[PDB]
């Protein structure tokens, strides 16, 4: 008889949990039915976007397992994700290869 | 006819503008600029007069602050003349740009 | 008898360390430094292993970021050698002081 | 011996739709957990401010949407808004 609010909304992310985390969070006295559905979809979408590009970067390294380095390379190579995460450190991410042109040897 | 040397009026102007707090952009042009940009986001918008003055106070305090950092960038290069590359190095280090 | 020129091993370390993600400070020295500084705020402290690593990750990412800005401040001054004045300009414009 | 909830189950399912032959390290999964919790906090926080500014007791789909527009850059915002409207469309059409 029971069907998860997620299976109804077409999501892998837990609508039920998002709803509870909104309540136990002191964000507002009340919480509209759709708010946790929307919010769950947004977080899923952004997760797909990152796992998509992290996947591609793992593929380029002849690798099947996404590591933090793959997450860093995807995020910092994307203008929008890099801005969203502009004040965030990926542990064990390292940096993009970048050597200022004038530091390159002459011949 | 007696000329001040280059720099003398520029220092007089630093002293005078650092002493005062009046907005330095003309009110009406700035208001036309706000209306144009807003209109390009949404048509049929109006503005409380205080909304435009808040924008002007925030825009001038931002530009003044940016010129201080820009000036520090020129001087670090052993110049006294700010250039475009000073403003952009400053914005890069402020984290306003990549 | 074969000797690499000045800056040829420097480029190689750059290429090498920009490719890797390992922490670059030896753990024990850093753990000792953490406990010292922390002693001054509350004595008889214990640290989760993950606490100290969080701190080393954050502290290394910070110092790498600062060296990048520092490097841009040196190159802006038509140099290729980072100096205290470059670190100090990067901190000033970032708003970490002055 | 008490429950320590995370998003890992959900991160893993989205991984499989998107890269079905791709795995993910413990450390990488920790980073995706931080990610979800961080954007959760930012969006919920902006939605709370919006409701507070408009003297409202309730965070609806609308506060989430406005929050997403304020917080996501350009194209991310557009696609997030469309994934969000879609999920709320599907869910309002489910007996």
């Amino acid at each position: 008889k029971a069907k998860t609010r997620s299976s109804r909304a077409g999501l892998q992310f837990p609508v039920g949990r998002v709803h509870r985390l909104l309540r136990k969070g002191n964000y507002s006295e009340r919480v509209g039915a759709g708010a946790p559905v929307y919010l769950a979809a947004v977080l899923e979408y952004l997760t797909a976007e990152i796992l998509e590009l992290a996947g591609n970067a793992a593929r380029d390294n002849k690798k099947t397992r996404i590591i933090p380095r793959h997450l860093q390379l995807a995020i910092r190579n994307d203008e929008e994700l890099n801005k969203l995460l502009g004040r965030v450190t990926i542990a064990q991410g390292g940096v993009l290869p970048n050597i200022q042109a004038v530091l390159l040897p002459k011949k | 006819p007696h000329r001040y040397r280059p720099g003398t009026v520029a220092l007089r102007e630093i002293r005078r503008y650092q002493k005062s707090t009046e907005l330095l952009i003309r009110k009406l042009p700035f208001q036309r600029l706000v209306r144009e940009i807003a209109q390009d986001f949404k048509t049929d918008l109006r503005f409380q007069s205080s909304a435009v003055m808040a924008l002007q106070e925030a825009c001038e305090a931002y530009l003044v602050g940016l010129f201080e950092d820009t000036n520090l960038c020129a001087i670090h290069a052993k110049r006294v003349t700010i250039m475009p590359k000073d403003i952009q190095l400053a914005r890069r280090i402020r984290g306003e740009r990549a | 008898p074969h000797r690499y020129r000045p800056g040829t091993v420097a480029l190689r370390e750059i290429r090498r360390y920009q490719k890797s993600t390992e922490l670059l400070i030896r753990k024990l020295p850093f753990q000792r430094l953490v406990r010292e500084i922390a002693q001054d705020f509350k004595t008889d402290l214990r640290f989760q292993s993950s606490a100290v690593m969080a701190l080393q990750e954050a502290c290394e990412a910070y110092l790498v970021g600062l060296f990048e800005d520092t490097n841009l401040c040196a190159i802006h001054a038509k140099r290729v050698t980072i100096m205290p004045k470059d670190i100090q300009l990067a901190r000033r414009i970032r708003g970490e002081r002055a | 011996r008490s429950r320590k909830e995370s998003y890992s189950v959900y991160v893993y399912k989205v991984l499989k739709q998107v890269h079905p032959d791709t795995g993910i390290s413990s450390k990488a999964m920790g980073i995706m957990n931080s990610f979800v919790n961080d954007i959760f906090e930012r969006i919920a926080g902006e939605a709370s401010r919006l409701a507070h500014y408009n003297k409202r007791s309730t965070i609806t789909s609308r506060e989430i949407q406005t929050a997403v527009r304020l917080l996501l850059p350009g194209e991310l915002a557009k696609h997030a808004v469309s994934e969000g409207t879609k999920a709320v469309t599907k869910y309002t059409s489910a007996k």
């Binding site: 797909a48 976007e49 190579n77 994307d78 929008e80 | 190095l89 990549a98 | - | 994934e83």
Partner: peptide, 17 residues
């Protein structure tokens, strides 16, 4: 997968490249 992902992704324009 079944997500409305971004068609094109641009890189950020870094100061000093």
């Amino acid at each position: 997968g079944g997500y409305n992902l971004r068609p094109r992704t641009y890189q950020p324009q870094r100061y000093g490249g």
